[PDB]
Design an enzyme around this catalytic site. Structure first.
Site, PDB file in Angstrom:
ATOM      1  N   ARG A 126      64.715  65.694  29.861  1.00  0.00           N
ATOM      2  CA  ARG A 126      65.574  64.630  29.294  1.00  0.00           C
ATOM      3  C   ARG A 126      64.630  63.478  29.170  1.00  0.00           C
ATOM      4  O   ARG A 126      63.622  63.136  29.808  1.00  0.00           O
ATOM      5  CB  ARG A 126      66.676  64.296  30.165  1.00  0.00           C
ATOM      6  CG  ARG A 126      67.793  65.379  30.217  1.00  0.00           C
ATOM      7  CD  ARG A 126      68.778  64.645  31.184  1.00  0.00           C
ATOM      8  NE  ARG A 126      68.418  64.373  32.469  1.00  0.00           N
ATOM      9  CZ  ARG A 126      69.031  63.556  33.349  1.00  0.00           C
ATOM     10  NH1 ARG A 126      70.232  63.231  32.804  1.00  0.00           N
ATOM     11  NH2 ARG A 126      68.499  62.959  34.362  1.00  0.00           N
ATOM     12  N   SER A 165      58.715  66.989  38.497  1.00  0.00           N
ATOM     13  CA  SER A 165      58.543  67.924  39.726  1.00  0.00           C
ATOM     14  C   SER A 165      57.884  69.150  39.656  1.00  0.00           C
ATOM     15  O   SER A 165      58.347  70.304  39.247  1.00  0.00           O
ATOM     16  CB  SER A 165      60.310  68.308  39.980  1.00  0.00           C
ATOM     17  OG  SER A 165      60.744  69.382  39.048  1.00  0.00           O
ATOM     18  N   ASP A 208      61.741  62.871  42.863  1.00  0.00           N
ATOM     19  CA  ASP A 208      62.865  62.402  42.387  1.00  0.00           C
ATOM     20  C   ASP A 208      64.074  62.060  43.513  1.00  0.00           C
ATOM     21  O   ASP A 208      64.769  61.097  43.147  1.00  0.00           O
ATOM     22  CB  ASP A 208      63.702  63.906  41.939  1.00  0.00           C
ATOM     23  CG  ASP A 208      63.753  65.032  42.887  1.00  0.00           C
ATOM     24  OD1 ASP A 208      63.430  64.561  44.288  1.00  0.00           O
ATOM     25  OD2 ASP A 208      64.105  66.110  42.635  1.00  0.00           O
TER      26      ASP A 208
HETATM   27  N1  LIG Z   1      60.233  72.793  42.556  1.00  0.00           N
HETATM   28  C1  LIG Z   1      61.337  72.080  42.759  1.00  0.00           C
HETATM   29  C2  LIG Z   1      62.462  71.456  42.886  1.00  0.00           C
HETATM   30  C3  LIG Z   1      62.583  70.037  42.625  1.00  0.00           C
HETATM   31  C4  LIG Z   1      63.699  69.370  42.761  1.00  0.00           C
HETATM   32  C5  LIG Z   1      64.699  70.238  43.349  1.00  0.00           C
HETATM   33  S1  LIG Z   1      66.252  69.187  43.713  1.00  0.00           S
HETATM   34  O1  LIG Z   1      66.085  68.073  42.868  1.00  0.00           O
HETATM   35  O2  LIG Z   1      67.296  69.891  43.713  1.00  0.00           O
HETATM   36  N2  LIG Z   1      65.919  68.668  45.322  1.00  0.00           N
HETATM   37  C6  LIG Z   1      65.049  67.510  45.594  1.00  0.00           C
HETATM   38  C7  LIG Z   1      63.842  68.317  46.653  1.00  0.00           C
HETATM   39  O3  LIG Z   1      63.766  69.747  46.256  1.00  0.00           O
HETATM   40  C8  LIG Z   1      62.683  70.184  47.178  1.00  0.00           C
HETATM   41  O4  LIG Z   1      62.812  69.827  48.535  1.00  0.00           O
HETATM   42  C9  LIG Z   1      61.494  69.728  46.515  1.00  0.00           C
HETATM   43  N3  LIG Z   1      60.337  70.230  47.208  1.00  0.00           N
HETATM   44  C10 LIG Z   1      59.531  71.187  46.678  1.00  0.00           C
HETATM   45  O5  LIG Z   1      60.016  71.708  45.175  1.00  0.00           O
HETATM   46  C11 LIG Z   1      58.470  71.880  47.362  1.00  0.00           C
HETATM   47  C12 LIG Z   1      58.502  73.138  47.773  1.00  0.00           C
HETATM   48  C13 LIG Z   1      57.500  73.571  48.368  1.00  0.00           C
HETATM   49  C14 LIG Z   1      56.276  72.677  48.571  1.00  0.00           C
HETATM   50  C15 LIG Z   1      56.373  71.490  48.416  1.00  0.00           C
HETATM   51  C16 LIG Z   1      55.144  70.469  48.484  1.00  0.00           C
HETATM   52  C17 LIG Z   1      54.591  70.242  49.901  1.00  0.00           C
HETATM   53  C18 LIG Z   1      53.670  69.799  50.307  1.00  0.00           C
HETATM   54  C19 LIG Z   1      53.192  68.889  49.358  1.00  0.00           C
HETATM   55  C20 LIG Z   1      53.950  69.005  48.049  1.00  0.00           C
HETATM   56  C21 LIG Z   1      54.813  69.932  47.582  1.00  0.00           C
HETATM   57  C22 LIG Z   1      57.225  71.108  47.488  1.00  0.00           C
HETATM   58  C23 LIG Z   1      61.401  68.285  46.708  1.00  0.00           C
HETATM   59  O6  LIG Z   1      60.390  67.819  45.774  1.00  0.00           O
HETATM   60  C24 LIG Z   1      62.664  67.513  45.906  1.00  0.00           C
HETATM   61  O7  LIG Z   1      62.668  66.309  46.498  1.00  0.00           O
HETATM   62  C25 LIG Z   1      64.613  71.299  43.895  1.00  0.00           C
HETATM   63  C26 LIG Z   1      63.498  71.958  43.660  1.00  0.00           C
END
Ligand SMILES: N#Cc1ccc(S(=O)(=O)NC[C@H]2O[C@H](O)[C@H](NC(=O)c3cccc(-c4ccccc4)c3)[C@@H](O)[C@@H]2O)cc1
Ligand SMILES: N#Cc1ccc(S(=O)(=O)NC[C@H]2O[C@H](O)[C@H](NC(=O)c3cccc(-c4ccccc4)c3)[C@@H](O)[C@@H]2O)cc1
Length: 895
Positions: free
Chosen positions: A523, A587, A641
């Site tokens: 968006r 993300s 986010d």
């Molecule tokens: N791809 C996605 C995504 C985004 C938003 C959503 S969401 O907006 O529905 N929820 C918010 C949170 O979702 C997860 O926890 C996200 N972590 C990861 O994806 C993740 C997963 C595995 C490892 C690492 C990692 C670990 C260490 C360092 C960097 C990255 C990060 C986090 O960034 C976000 O804060 C849902 C999913």
């Protein structure tokens, strides 16, 4: 030829299928009159709750006792039930007699008699040191308020015993047994003979939801949904109804069907104007009903030369048994002659074919009326289960249907016409209501065993106050080791620095662009800010899709496409030519070295775009903005986010130091003292940390809380052994946990009748929006059944209760673990400052927090209870995903 003379005489006792189906519609109104609170006291079909909550599923096991009091003799039974797979019931019984002495005597003398016989039976039968359920089927009119409480309305067949009528017969049998002192009895069930019949047949065939008796009397019972039963409290589940349909028509609703012979039997009976439906269909009255057709035809000179005999005019002298004979012999009109002669007549051949025919007419009318009211019952069972084709089995007993030659078959054929939308099977019960009453207490124990069985699994998902405080501190422990420089690299929770160092004040104004990018559709966001008191934030977006061509192509093409969209958006707002600062939500896994530097580590979610991984995302972006000419935008910052979600609630509430998202994912952030963040040089000030806490537990630190279901979800996920704390609290995962629990129960016979749909084996069917509707449903739980039918699963009432319960427990644990994590955050925010009483606010976004009925609550109380000193408000954010990116910029712009 004497036949068609008979049929034209008896024309109103030959019922068209049309008449039968209109009788079904009448009976259905009578069923609803009895089930309803206001209409039941004057309803002729009494529709009596039996308190049986389930038919047998076949896994019942135990030893059980039973009494059958039919009068002048009773039986005392012993039923051995083994779950070996055979469903072969082992029985023993004995008859004993109640003589007129006890019979016309006093109530307590009567039950002291019964209690003694029972003990003499247990003495003969070995078992008297065992404490066993009973087992009680007696037919005298009753008012029944409980399984184990039933009051005697009046006696029948020669019982005068005082102190019984209007008194609970279970209290009488129990007090007697106390007085003896030699044995003891477990739970009691008081069961009508139809309910007994249904129950015993349903132990062989587990589709049997209707009991039926065409006996000397006639009655039927069925399974029925508690939402339709007004007279018993609660809308969940089902319960068997004793219809007492013999009384159908007592208010005159059948008087256009009933002939004059029907009138005359009612006047000649012991109970005028009562049980009129019986008196048409059943064994007591059926031969008598032939008697009167003979009498009247002879008084009209259509039979016997107008001549009668003294025996033909005595009630009872022509018997139901005489009908079964006449219709059963190869030569029926010789057996007719014989029966007529016995009555003192000199019959002719035409007199005998006439008597034979009248018999068929009366017996066929009886089997057709049963069909009619069986049709209404079948029809309602169909509407309650709510599917177009119905398999249902009817257990049947009584001497008419067993011993009359053609009537069972006539009933079978007629029912199956009247309801073509049903596959219906009939099963006769032999040993009767002796077995049945016993089987009710067997099912009563099975329901208990299974309830406790499945509640013992759901305890693994129920956590104590002390268990949560443990995970609370395991959060802190594993926060510290992510900040410090030594352990960061081994750390599951990385505690990554955001480089967002300052929160809002009232000052910020102006318009900002925001780009929220992950997945195939981004968006573009215009965000206008109004500084000062009141004021607020105004948002306009538009959604664009990245073509499938473009993300399997080169990385520079990707960001030119992105920039065309930004250029299209602001020209759609009417700003084309305006330059603005731009916040950026990207993300993907990223190491973010500056606030405006972040390096793409690895592409995800189907982006193959080359020349990207290992590069700074903002340079790619503004190198793509440089290209467009004349296009200039200032790319100030890039954000996770959660960080945005928090900054979004920074503008409403001055005090918000904490973001949280329980989404498809889960994560959280606070502003930590610069003192404590060891990967960024300098100790002065504070710093927001992106916890990436969904990775809490990937070292194993949660592995003692993790049920086999948590491990089943973990092992088949795309990222096995990674993101475990997320897989307990959020997103796709909770449905999957629910689904694996349900699968477990069903393998154990505890849910869904032991039988796993292929449609139940499908991953992903339970979506978080469905868990939300499931847990917010109540009363009759019609919304859970709908959803279950929507997903291609068995929708039955009893299975809803469980599915709902499994969901509620899974969702509770999720909120609870989420509080315990959010409590660690707010306590260390106190401990960093040496403060004690601390007032904080958490901006929160994400699909499950806002839309799950209980989740936001349950977590609120979880952090109030686990962090007593902090005072924590949660403010909902609403699209701090992309909107927070512009607002991180407006604060960045303030410097
Ligand atoms: N791809 C996605 C995504 C985004 C938003 C959503 S969401 O907006 O529905 N929820 C918010 C949170 O979702 C997860 O926890 C996200 N972590 C990861 O994806 C993740 C997963 C595995 C490892 C690492 C990692 C670990 C260490 C360092 C960097 C990255 C990060 C986090 O960034 C976000 O804060 C849902 C999913
Ligand atoms: N006394 C008998 C008896 C038992 C079994 C048989 S039987 O086994 O041969 N036939 C089975 C059916 O017969 C009758 O219709 C029974 N109802 C009545 O007689 C009746 C008649 C009038 C009122 C109430 C009443 C009222 C309130 C509460 C319960 C019942 C019941 C019905 O309960 C039974 O299920 C034959 C005869």
């Amino acid at each position: 030829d004497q036949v068609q003379k008979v049929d034209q005489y008896l024309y109103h006792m030959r019922l068209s299928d049309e008449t039968l189906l209109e009788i079904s519609k009448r009976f259905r109104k009578e069923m609803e009159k009895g089930l309803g609170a206001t209409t039941h006291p004057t309803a002729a079909v009494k529709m009596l709750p039996t308190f049986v909550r389930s038919t047998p599923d076949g896994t019942e096991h135990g030893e059980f006792l039973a009494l059958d009091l039919g009068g002048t003799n009773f039986r005392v039974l012993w039923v051995k039930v083994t779950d070996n797979g055979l469903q072969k019931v082992e029985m023993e019984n004995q008859i004993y007699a109640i003589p007129e002495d006890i019979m016309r005597g006093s109530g307590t003398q009567l039950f002291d008699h019964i209690a003694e016989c029972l003990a003499n039976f247990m003495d003969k039968l070995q078992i008297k040191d065992k404490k066993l359920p009973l087992g009680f089927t007696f037919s005298f009119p009753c008012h029944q308020t409980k399984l184990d409480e039933s009051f005697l309305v009046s006696w029948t067949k020669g019982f005068k015993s005082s102190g019984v009528e209007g008194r609970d017969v279970v209290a009488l049998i129990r007090k007697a047994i106390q007085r003896r002192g030699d044995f003891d009895i477990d739970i009691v069930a008081v069961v009508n003979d139809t309910v007994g019949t249904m129950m015993t047949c349903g132990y062989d065939d587990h589709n049997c939801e209707i009991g039926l008796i065409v006996g000397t009397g006639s009655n039927a019972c069925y399974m029925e949904e508690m939402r339709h039963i007004d007279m018993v409290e609660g809308d969940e589940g089902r319960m068997c109804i004793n219809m007492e349909w013999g009384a159908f028509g007592d208010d005159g609703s059948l008087n256009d069907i009933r002939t004059e012979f029907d009138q005359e039997i009612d006047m000649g009976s012991l109970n005028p104007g009562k049980q009129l439906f019986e008196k048409m269909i059943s064994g007591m009255y059926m031969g008598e009903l032939v008697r009167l057709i003979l009498v009247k035809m002879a008084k009209e000179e259509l039979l016997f030369g107008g001549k009668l005999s003294p025996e033909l005019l005595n009630t009872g002298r022509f018997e139901t048994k005489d009908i079964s004979d006449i219709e059963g012999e190869k030569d029926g009109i010789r057996k007719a002659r014989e029966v007529l002669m016995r009555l003192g007549l000199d019959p002719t051949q035409e007199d005998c074919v006439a008597t034979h025919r009248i018999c068929q007419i009366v017996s066929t009318r009886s089997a057709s009326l049963c069909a009619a009211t069986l049709a209404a019952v079948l029809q309602r069972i169909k509407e309650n289960k709510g599917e177009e084709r119905l398999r249902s089995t009817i257990g049947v007993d009584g001497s008419v249907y067993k011993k009359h030659p053609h009537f069972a078959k006539r009933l079978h054929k007629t029912v199956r016409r009247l309801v073509p939308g049903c596959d219906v099977r009939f099963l006769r019960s032999e040993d009767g209501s002796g077995k049945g009453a016993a089987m009710v207490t067997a099912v009563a124990y099975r329901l208990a065993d299974q309830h406790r069985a499945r509640q013992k699994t759901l305890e693994h998902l129920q956590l104590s106050h002390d268990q949560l405080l443990e995970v609370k501190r395991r959060m802190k422990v594993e926060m510290e080791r992510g900040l410090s420089k030594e352990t960061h690299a081994s750390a599951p929770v990385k505690m990554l620095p955001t480089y967002v160092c300052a929160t809002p004040d009232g000052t910020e104004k102006g318009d900002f662009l925001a780009l929220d990018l992950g997945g195939t559709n981004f968006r573009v966001l215009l965000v206008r800010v109004r500084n000062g008191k009141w004021g607020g934030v105004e948002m306009h977006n538009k959604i664009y899709a990245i073509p499938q061509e473009v993300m399997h192509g080169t990385g520079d093409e990707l960001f030119d496409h992105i920039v065309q969209c930004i250029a299209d958006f602001l020209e759609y707002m009417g700003m084309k030519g305006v330059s603005l600062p731009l916040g950026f939500t990207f993300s993907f896994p990223c190491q973010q070295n500056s606030l405006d530097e972040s390096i793409l580590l690895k592409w995800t979610k189907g982006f193959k775009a080359s020349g990207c991984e290992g590069e700074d995302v903002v340079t790619l972006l503004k190198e793509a903005i440089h290209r467009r000419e004349e296009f200039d935008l200032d790319v100030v910052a890039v954000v996770n986010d959660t960080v945005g979600t928090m900054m979004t609630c920074g503008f409403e509430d001055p005090h918000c130091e904490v973001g949280l998202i329980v989404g498809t994912g889960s994560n959280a952030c606070y502003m930590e003292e610069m003192r404590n963040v060891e990967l960024v040089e300098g100790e002065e000030g504070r710093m927001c940390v992106n916890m990436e806490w969904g990775a809490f537990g990937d070292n194993g630190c949660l592995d003692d809380f993790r049920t086999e279901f948590d491990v089943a979800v973990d092992e088949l996920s795309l990222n096995p052994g990674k993101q475990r704390f997320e897989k307990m609290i959020s997103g796709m995962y909770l449905g999957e946990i629910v689904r694996n629990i349900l699968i477990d129960f069903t393998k154990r016979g505890l849910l869904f009748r032991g039988r796993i749909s292929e449609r139940l084996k499908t991953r992903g069917i339970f979506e978080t929006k469905f868990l939300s509707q499931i847990e917010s449903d109540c009363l009759a739980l019609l919304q859970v059944r709908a959803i279950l039918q929507h997903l291609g699963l068995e929708s039955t009432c009893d299975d809803s209760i469980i599915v709902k319960e499994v969901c509620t427990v899974v969702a509770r644990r999720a909120a609870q673990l989420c509080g315990a994590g959010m409590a660690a955050v707010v306590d260390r925010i106190r401990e960093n400052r040496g403060l004690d009483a601390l007032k904080v606010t958490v901006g929160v976004d994400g699909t499950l927090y806002k839309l799950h009925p209980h989740f936001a609550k349950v977590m609120h109380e979880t952090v109030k209870d686990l962090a007593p000193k902090c005072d924590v408000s949660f403010l909902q954010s609403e699209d701090g995903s992309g909107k927070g990116a512009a607002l991180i910029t407006a604060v960045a712009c303030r410097i």
